[PDB]
Design a protein around this nucleic acid. Structure first.
Ligand SMILES: Nc1ncnc2c1ncn2[C@@H]1O[C@H](COP(=O)(O)OP(=O)(O)O)[C@@H](O)[C@H]1O
Ligand code: BEF
Ligand SMILES: [Mg+2]
Ligand SMILES: [Mg+2]
Ligand SMILES: [Mg+2]
Ligand SMILES: [Mg+2]
Length: 431
RNA sequence: CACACCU
């Protein structure tokens, strides 16, 4: 890898606060227990922090945090901030809506602030990879909230939008780059950016990015980054099947978890499962929507199995005067952007979507998630229902489960049991 | 598979 030709750089600038350093090992274990933090046995890991002022942040960042009325770091932030700041490779697993984005973005800003300034021809220092274009844009917006107080520049690299403005941003110079894989691979092959200064690599939704469709794109990208980079992977779900594969992209790494070690949903979601025949779904949906739309807070996402079903259900509902719009991978990117912005603003309270909208999206005031079709996996179920109940908010999920979904019943029951939810007897009868 | 993911 030309182990001596590369420039030098530093990774660990973490200074442990005296309020944290004083904790004995037992006291640290009790703090972790109280926050439901588990650090994998045998890994190197700093003590968790428990206040924002422990976390080495620039005063600008603290000012933005206070302006947003953020009082206390979330559990994944409590353990992830110091681990990331220490420069260690890591995997950070915590519930949907629990703050993983800032868990990796704020240490990225510290990391960047300790490196020499970008010159001309310099690629990004921090690269974040995400599975959908809308999620990449959302993460870039979060980053801009905080990097803009320093003079940190960011961009979003993603398909479906003109290449020209993205090439401009990359050539002007960005310290932070958020990307979906395809457009980035395109730009790397054609020399529009490079990863020779990339020392902080984030895989968000990491188990999705390591799946059959994404893993070869990830491999193509990461094979171009120096192996002394820091790599940080994050997700609400971390199935055993991705763990060995993940080691291809990690070095001397540490795994941390919040909540139960098994597959688990956000416990602020009320989870309802309606066992019914496929032919009943239409009527049941309308019944449900009539209830939902009678309430003052009624913003709703309806998930379906295919782009064709998403289009068809949306036409069927709009023809009855329902204010529904849809997002899926066959729409143009300007249309996808417009529909999601209309949903965010509340101008359209019903979003019908494929799994393009299942991960990462943080939309204010979603109160209902409806699985019109049960998803492809129990992990996808956990992510979908996590579009509600963000941060401290509560939410409700309704799922239509048919006999054709029988093979997925066992794991669904386990998820429902882990969350202390009431199980529909028809679901148990299925097994 | 779906579903995402450059052109
Ligand atoms: N320490 C905190 N206190 C309160 N809210 C927070 C905190 N950290 C993040 N949030 C908010 O929680 C919401 C969900 O965060 P996000 O990073 O999207 O969750 P995740 O990536 O874990 O699914 C965001 O609106 C974010 O602004
Ligand atoms: F897990 Be969060 F919904 F990205
Ligand atoms: Mg390491
Ligand atoms: Mg490292
Ligand atoms: Mg879990
Ligand atoms: Mg997220």
């Amino acid at each position: 890898w030309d182990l001596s030709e590369l420039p030098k750089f530093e990774k660990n600038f973490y200074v442990e606060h005296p309020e944290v350093a004083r904790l004995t090992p037992y006291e640290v274990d009790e703090l972790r227990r109280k926050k439901e933090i588990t650090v994998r046995g045998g890994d190197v890991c700093p003590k968790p922090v428990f206040a924002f002022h422990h976390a080495n942040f620039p005063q600008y960042v603290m000012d933005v945090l206070m302006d947003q009325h953020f009082t206390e770091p979330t559990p994944i932030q409590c353990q992830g901030f110091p681990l990331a700041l220490s420069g260690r490779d890591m995997v950070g697993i915590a519930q949907t809506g629990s703050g993983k984005t800032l868990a990796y973005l704020l240490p990225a800003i510290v990391h960047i602030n300790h490196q020499p300034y970008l010159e001309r021809g310099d690629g990004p220092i921090c690269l974040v990879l995400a599975p959908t274009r809308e999620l990449a844009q959302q993460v870039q917006q979060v980053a801009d909230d905080y990097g803009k107080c320093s003079r940190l520049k960011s961009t979003c690299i993603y398909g479906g939008a003109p290449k020209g403005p993205q090439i401009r941003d990359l050539e002007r110079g960005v310290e932070i780059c958020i990307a979906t894989p395809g457009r980035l691979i395109d730009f790397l092959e054609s020399g529009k950016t490079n990863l020779r200064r990339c020392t902080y690599l984030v895989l968000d939704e990491a188990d999705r990015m390591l799946d059959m469709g994404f893993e070869p794109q990830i491999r193509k990208i990461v094979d171009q980054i120096r192996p002394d980079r820091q790599t940080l992977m994050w997700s609400a779900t971390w199935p055993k099947e991705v763990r060995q594969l993940a080691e291809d992209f990690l070095r001397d790494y540490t795994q941390i978890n919040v909540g139960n070690l098994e597959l688990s949903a956000n416990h602020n979601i009320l989870q309802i499962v309606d066992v019914c025949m496929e032919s009943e779904k239409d009527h049941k949906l309308i019944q449900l929507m009539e209830e939902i739309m009678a309430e003052k807070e009624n913003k709703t996402i309806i998930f379906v199995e295919t782009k064709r079903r998403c289009d068809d259900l949306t036409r069927r509902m709009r023809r009855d005067g329902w204010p529904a719009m849809c997002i899926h991978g066959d729409k143009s990117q300007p249309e996808r952007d417009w529909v999601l912005n209309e949903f965010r603003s509340g101008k359209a309270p019903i979003l019908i979507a494929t799994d393009v909208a299942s991960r990462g999206l943080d939309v204010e005031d979603v109160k209902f998630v409806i699985n019109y079709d049960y998803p492809n996996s129990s992990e996808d179920y956990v992510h979908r229902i996590g579009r509600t109940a963000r941060s401290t908010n509560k939410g409700t999920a309704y799922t239509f489960f048919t006999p054709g979904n029988l093979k997925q019943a066992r794991e669904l029951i386990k998820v429902l049991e882990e969350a202390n939810q009431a199980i529909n007897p028809k679901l148990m009868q299925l097994v």
